[PDB]
């Protein structure tokens with residue numbers, strides 16, 4: 001029993017982290033096969049960052065201008081190209097620790113583990129959600145750019161996030177591994193703000209199922225609701241609409257507990273309308289929305305990785 | 307910016323996890339050099355567990371009775387002995403992935419990362435505190451016994467916890483790597499309960515410093531207090547006494563922020579007496595006590611591991 005925000009084991013990703021320096025800018029790179037992937041703003045000085053012309057800055061770089069270090073070992077750069085907001089450095093050594101991997105662009109609402117790195121070395125690991133407003137609530141200091149986010153399925157690392165920047169409120173923005181930002185952000189130092197965020201409804205419901213499995217059942221009421229009249233209430237409290245796909249995804253937890261999804265929706269409605277009256281659910285005094293249904297199933301069933 | 311419950315990168319520990327089976331009991335083992343360490347109750351059937359005589363059960367085991375699997379590879383057991391509540395299986399192969407390591411018995415109040423494992427394979431990683439009542443608030447299903455807890459300093463893994471059992475309330479108990487339990491628990495299936503717990507005061511203060519560093523400063527008042535009159539208030543709200551050692555340990559955060567520890571103690575007193583009035587600190591609606599001063603410094607300074 002027990003329910004914790006749990007990160008994927010990080011070892012397969014740790015083996016891919018390197019340091020990339022261009023001029024006086026150092027950040028983290030991801031070494032897979034014979035390519036190193038990093039944020040393109042490694043080629044900027046601080047000055048350059050108010051409004052860089054990346055294509056122009058890169059024209060003036062040679063291979064040798066990129067110092068790539070994997071612990072003690074310099075990897076010689078033999079080629080370079082830019083894809084969207086990501087720089088790809090071809091190197092003369094294939095990473096022997098390259099795991100089975102994919103690049104995935106995740107959907108808002110989905111979770112992933114971040115391996116926070118400085119100077120190519122890991123600091124720690126923690127689980128995030130891609131917020132509806134295309135930010136994550138991370139922990140990132142100067143030097144963390146190029147740290148990645150990932151999911152593990154069995155033996156396969158699905159990389160979904162590379163860290164680029166911090167927005168007002170201390171939330172974070174970045175790209176997929178093809179260098180396309182999540183959300184409307186650009187890699188320039190100018191005024192940008194996150195859109196107003198929403199609460200990931202399907203994830204709150206998944207977490208209420210986790211509470212039930214763990215024996216925390218006080219908030220269960222005797223009523224039901226329609227999907228329509230639940231969604232009107234959700235709209236008021238800035239909760240995203242629950243779709244039938246969401247209902248179907250919650251099917252395994254609903255079956256395991258014997259609680260119909262629409263009955264759990266009734267229970268949530270009452271929590272939204274009445275508050276928690278100083279009570280906690282799973283240790284928490286607020287409703288948690290950064291656990292997916294899959295996260296709950298994984299954690300409450302003991303799913304492991306190879 | 308940002309502040310997250312952050313686990314140590316797990317890769318060095320992942321390389322040490324194995325599966326141990328004796329009869330029909332399978333759990334996790336820790337493979338370091340040519341020794342595998344696991345809970346001694348691997349030698350029990352379910353039946354045996356109401357009141358095992360471990361010394362007697364072990365007398366009747368041969369080396370061959372222990373099946374140790376490291377992924378695909380069976381490791382042949384060539385020796386076995388029991389130390390307190392831990393079984394040590396000498397094997398014919400030294401683990402080539404053995405990191406630099408130590409066994410440490412941590413103090414109540416200190417934190418560590420748990421690598422949750424099933425069948426010798428990692429499921430995920432998360433940070434815990436050794437509670438004043440010698441439990442941890444973990445996430446452990448049947449099959450997780452033998453999962454370990456650890457700290458990383460630079461290149462060195464300090465193992466401090468091996469998982470053995472779950473108590474009422476869904477909290478967890480286990481041993482150091484010399485097989486001595488934390489707290490008064492015994493490895494038998496009988497009625498045991500955790501002592502009433504207390505709040506780790508020094509850790510709450512460390513977390514209030516983290517909030518200040520992150521710009522969440524609303525709870526700072528204009529007053530100070532004495533260590534004596536703070537500690538009277540703490541006693542009422544079931545907070546552990548703050549000692550001068552604790553004050554000295556908070557020195558780095560106090561210096562960095564310019565807020566004297568006794569001034570922060572005044573601010574905490576008011577939060578304890580008046581509540582938070584529906585406000586949050588660092589996203590949280592409750593006071594958090596599972597960050598040590600070192601954890602805050604590490605996270606807010608970007609300390610990394612080799």
Ligand SMILES: *[C@](O)(C(=O)N1CCC1)[C@H](C[C@@H]1CCCNC1=O)NC(=O)[C@@H]1[C@@H]2[C@H](CN1C(=O)[C@@H](NC(=O)C(F)(F)F)C(C)(C)C)C2(C)C
Pocket residue numbers: 025026027041049140141142143144145164165166167168172186187188189190191192193307
């Ligand atoms: C990242 O570039 C880094 O770690 N580097 C470069 C050498 C090491 C850095 C990470 C930031 C730093 C502040 C604390 N946490 C972080 O995640 N990114 C970075 O500095 C990016 C970078 C230029 C600006 N920038 C920012 O994050 C800006 N943000 C904005 O300008 C914003 F308002 F749009 F959000 C701040 C430095 C003001 C936080 C570019 C976007 C190219």
Ligand SMILES: *[C@](O)(C(=O)N1CCC1)[C@H](C[C@@H]1CCCNC1=O)NC(=O)[C@@H]1[C@@H]2[C@H](CN1C(=O)[C@@H](NC(=O)C(F)(F)F)C(C)(C)C)C2(C)C
Pocket residue numbers: 001331332333347355446447448449450451470471472473474478492493494495496497498499
């Ligand atoms: C652990 O032995 C395990 O994972 N195994 C053995 C084959 C795989 C198991 C972990 C438990 C299981 C329940 C969910 N979470 C856990 O952490 N430990 C285990 O079963 C231990 C073991 C015998 C009893 N026991 C318990 O945890 C008991 N607890 C008690 O008896 C208690 F009240 F004292 F706390 C329960 C099974 C009732 C939870 C021994 C202590 C030797």
